[PDB]
Amino acid sequence: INTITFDAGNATINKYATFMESLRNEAKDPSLKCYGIPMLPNTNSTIKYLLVKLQGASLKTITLMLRRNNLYVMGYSDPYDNKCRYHIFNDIKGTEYSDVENTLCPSSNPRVAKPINYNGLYPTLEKKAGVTSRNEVQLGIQILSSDIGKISGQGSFTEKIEAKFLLVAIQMVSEAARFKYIENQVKTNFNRDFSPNDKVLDLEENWGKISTAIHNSKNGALPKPLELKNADGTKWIVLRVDEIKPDVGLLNYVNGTCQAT
Numbered sequence: 001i002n003t004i005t006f007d008a009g010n011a012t013i014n015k016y017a018t019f020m021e022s023l024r025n026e027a028k029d030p031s032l033k034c035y036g037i038p039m040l041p042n043t044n045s046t047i048k049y050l051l052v053k054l055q056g057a058s059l060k061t062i063t064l065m066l067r068r069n070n071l072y073v074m075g076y077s078d079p080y081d082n083k084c085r086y087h088i089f090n091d092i093k094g095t096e097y098s099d100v101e102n103t104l105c106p107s108s109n110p111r112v113a114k115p116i117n118y119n120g121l122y123p124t125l126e127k128k129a130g131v132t133s134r135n136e137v138q139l140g141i142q143i144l145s146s147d148i149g150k151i152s153g154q155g156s157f158t159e160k161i162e163a164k165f166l167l168v169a170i171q172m173v174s175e176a177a178r179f180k181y182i183e184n185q186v187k188t189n190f191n192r193d194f195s196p197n198d199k200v201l202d203l204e205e206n207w208g209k210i211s212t213a214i215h216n217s218k219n220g221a222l223p224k225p226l227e228l229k230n231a232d233g234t235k236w237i238v239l240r241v242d243e244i245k246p247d248v249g250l251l252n253y254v255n256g257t258c259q260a261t
């Protein structure tokens, strides 16, 4: 469908809230839903990818390409030297690789490869970025805008700022779309840089666990206790779908029927 665009250079809470709502309605399987939370399609949807264009205050752009089944950033393009430059992780290959290369930068127009010489897993990204953990990498709307400027159209940039930009972009686009809690952490701190708290990391880490739990619930009761973390890192025991439902924007795909509402 339509490329979804977010202008980070000229943002408001309301435009970012709109962007989330957009991304969530385009990503979701139109029919699937459990306890009223929309669920992503499986890997045989009629449309398998989503493109997301971001703009900085410099007016430079970066377009991310997400796999729609699990909202995974597979790679990105920028305008470079009158060419479309595509950057793809080193583990995307064959039919996926050439749907990504050709949808970010079509055949009929000039393009040039610039590999991401690592994979898109958080550990790998933390390592290139030089941090033990991603709570050391700050997030925010100015940071996202500044980061687009540091890479878009630049002949040379380090793998450290590229991995920092991808830690920020995966969390403010993909994690924020999966979790309404992370979207509300960006709006709360809209006008500042912030470090993700311990509930933000735990939710990221447990999205699959959470999706399967809700999908598998009977009359609103979770199959077993779910132990997550509060904003201060203390333990939180979830027993019922409506204790976690305020924080979840989308569900990972889980096979089978579930209570739809």
Ligand SMILES: Nc1ncnc2c([C@@H]3O[C@H](COP(=O)(O)O)[C@@H](O)[C@H]3O)n[nH]c12
Binding pocket: 070, 071, 072, 073, 074, 120, 121, 122, 170, 174, 204, 205, 206, 207, 208
């Ligand atoms: N490049 C990327 N894009 C989106 N999500 C992720 C992730 C993490 O990816 C997981 C996605 O789930 P899968 O196990 O279905 O691949 C989420 O738990 C998310 O925290 N790592 N790298 C990612």
Ligand SMILES: *[C@@H]1O[C@H](CO)[C@@H](O)[C@H](O)[C@H]1NC(C)=O
Binding pocket: 255, 256, 257
């Ligand atoms: C998916 O779920 C449907 C309905 O329960 C079932 O018939 C099918 O066997 C499942 N597929 C897989 C791979 O388990």
